[model samples]
Target: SNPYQRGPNPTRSALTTDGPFSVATYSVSRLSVSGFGGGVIYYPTGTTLTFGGIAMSPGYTADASSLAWLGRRLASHGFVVIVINTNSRLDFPDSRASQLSAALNYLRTSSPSAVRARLDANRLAVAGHSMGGGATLRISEQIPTLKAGVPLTPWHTDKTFNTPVPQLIVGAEADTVAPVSQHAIPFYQNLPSTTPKVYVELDNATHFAPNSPNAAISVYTISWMKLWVDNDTRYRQFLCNVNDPALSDFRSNNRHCQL
Candidate 1:
């Protein structure tokens, strides 16, 4: 008595209530880029962490490839990121969460022989764009061990949580994708806790602003992660006081980022 709508995973037969289950597995890798934040971050030179997400693009792997671009950036920061392509447009939040969980489970239990030893299971985080950003929030709530959630212009709804982990909601003033006043504001307001959360509304930004021509959004986001995930005190200076000297770059690039 089973109704199969899509292709079944090979690991499905071994799934049990005790917790171990096999969903789809992903291939991760490393990449290199120059002049990104003045080369402040760098990958391990030869490693590339890829995810199945890129395969789930709008057609063949459109959205997946778009997200892969960010994965490239993340690798620069010394993370073996898990980017799951959740069947174009992230139409199903629950399904996306499941995929994210599968990725998380892999990171926790094991990775390829190459990544398993070098990966940091304790420092896990997630970020996304548009509907994928909505998926970030959905999955973060389900996985409490997630240290942070960064939603790049998330498709907001009424599902904000009261979690303690840093849930950094980033947006652009120019975004029409999910208007902040209508969508983002509710998410910022409804987030469950007061412990170190921030809604960084960038004035010179649009849905595409974070993707960058000026790279200002990139700077802000990296700082957000460094503050919570990396525990860099320098990043903390900007979070506690936007007027802090460390925020000079943000203000110079996006005048509207002023708090």
Candidate 2:
């Protein structure tokens, strides 16, 4: 049996909201942390069931709360999530990448007793927005063991990345700062076609779309994690041929994801 699949059968509507697990949160202080600024963790509440671990970050000048909505949302869907603060608000993409690694390491090794108890250290993922999104791509390359990554409207000077780790690239159509044409599309193209990868551009959205709650982003983000980290094929339906009106474009290299 697939013990990794923690929730009930998948539904498009359910993915857009909280999942089966009840979510509880705790704060990790920067003073007590190293390699990355500390932030908050949201974990699915359970006594015996463990969930995959995910670490995320905000864009330049943005604080941890920018991604808090997603962090708790993912936790509610049976994942242990850390929404991290950057070492400094001015940190660059590379710093963001390393900070995320440190954050994930903290989740695996140094987090509170409750988080460590609930986290499945083996199944880990990373996510970010803007420059943090760029870091999402960075960590996914540097850490081969990661099950999945989601980079939302990622902005970076570099575009090329190749890895077997599954990735879902979310882009915003009207994002002039880091236009989908320059950033997301190329990153999607560079990822190995042999492995699973998908890209979705939000309809008339901005670079800040991922900073808040949106069902369009949450649905795919949860499904990508479920498919890769949880190895739950039941969530596969959410990935392929999505008809969400909020998205302007969608593409996946896998035959299963064809529109």
Candidate 3:
């Protein structure tokens, strides 16, 4: 048995709103963590089932709180989400990549029993914004065990990405900092065709679109992880059938998400 699936059926509204779970969070102090700066863990309460673990990071010059809202967002959808801080605000994608891994390790072996109890160490995933998104890209290829990866307006340019991990790269069409034509699109195109991948570009959005709660980011962010990280077929409709006005382009190699 996979022990991966949780939550009831997926609803279109649930992607943007909360799910069936009541969320709770606690800060993992910086002094407590070794590799990355420290993070906050948001997990579903009142449920005994273990959810997939996800390590989320902020972009360059941003700390954990900038991306912390998504931690609560994803945790409400049945993930043990840890939004982490980087060792340095200027840390490169490679360092952020390793920091993401370090955060996962903390979740598995160093976190409190309650947080660890609700997390499935094996079904791990990563999601990040901007430079951190680049970190997600690089790390996916580095960590073969990852079930899913989401890179939001990622800014990395040099790397041969090859991983079986199902990746959903979110790009902002009008991003000047990390143009889709330059970073996100190329990154998606260069990824091995053997992997299940999706590239959804936000129409007229800036590089910071992922910083807040938008239906555009939440739909795929939640559904992609559900489909790949949890292998939940319930999310198929969203991943494939979405027609949000926020998107300017959508591409996918997802077997279930027929296009």
lDDT of 3 at 13: 80
Q: Is candidate 2 or candidate 3 better by TM-score?
A: 2
How does each model score on lDDT? 0.48, 0.90, 0.88
Provide the lowest-lDDT 10-residue window in model 3. Answer: 250-259
Q: Best candidate per TM-score, number?
A: 2
Order of models, best lDDT first: 2, 3, 1
For candidate 3, write residues 33-95 as lDDT tens digits.
899999899998998889998999899999988887787888999999999988899999989
- Name the lDDT of candidate 1: 0.48
All candidates: CA RMSD (Å) = 15.1, 1.7, 1.6
Clashing residue pairs in candidate 3 are none
**Which window of 10 residues has the lowest lDDT sum in candidate 2?**
250-259
Native-vs-model 2 lDDT? 0.90
Write candidate 2's Cα lDDT for 1-259 as tens digits: 9988787887888988877889889998889999999999999875479999999989999988999999999999999999999889999999999999999998999899888999989999999999999999999989989999999999989998777788899999999999999999999998877768899889999989898789999998998998889888888888876778988999987643532
Clashes of 2: 0
